[PDB]
Amino acid sequence: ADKELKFLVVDDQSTMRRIVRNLLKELGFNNVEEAEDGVDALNKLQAGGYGFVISDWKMPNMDGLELLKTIRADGAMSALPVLMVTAYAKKENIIAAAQAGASGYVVKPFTAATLEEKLNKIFEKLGM
Ligand code: BEF
Ligand SMILES: [Mn+2]
Known part of the structure; x- marks a missing residue:
């Protein structure tokens, strides 16, 4: 996928947002924003x-x-x-x-490898 692809990471626990943001960075995605719930997410979107x-x-x-x-x-x-x-x-x-x-859909707790795999499965499905 395009490394400038802009992600929104949504979770009410800062710990989990930090996990996901760091995983994305490792994957080469630095254009990442956070939201704390669905309302906050919709405002960002x-x-x-x-x-x-x-x-x-x-x-x-x-x-x-x-x-x-x-x-x-x-x-x-x-x-x-x-x-x-x-x-x-x-x-x-x-x-x-x-x-x-x-x-x-990923179930917590999850490994770095599981997140990377499931992101790639979606990229491939959507031709990204
Ligand atoms: F709070 Be989430 F659904 F893990
Ligand atoms: Mn939660």
Whole structure:
């Protein structure tokens, strides 16, 4: 993928945002911004130029499943890649996220190798 691709990393725990931002840097992606919940994320997205979203699920103000649905229903951003990264591991959560249009789903805790693999699977799927 394009190394200037602009990522938004969304999680209510700063620890996890830091993990994801550092992983992306190792992968050659330095154009990375953070948000603390779905509302904060939507505000950043509206400012424009984003090419990829990585999002938690459990967050105050707007949770990540609502964020994913909001993105998919909006004409300006409906095709935006969205990778879910969450501690929810039950099949019904995976199904609800997949059906709502998630590009990929990673269960926490995850390894560096798993994140890289799942990002690449999405790049290949979308011809990026
Ligand atoms: F809080 Be997340 F869904 F891991
Ligand atoms: Mn959370």
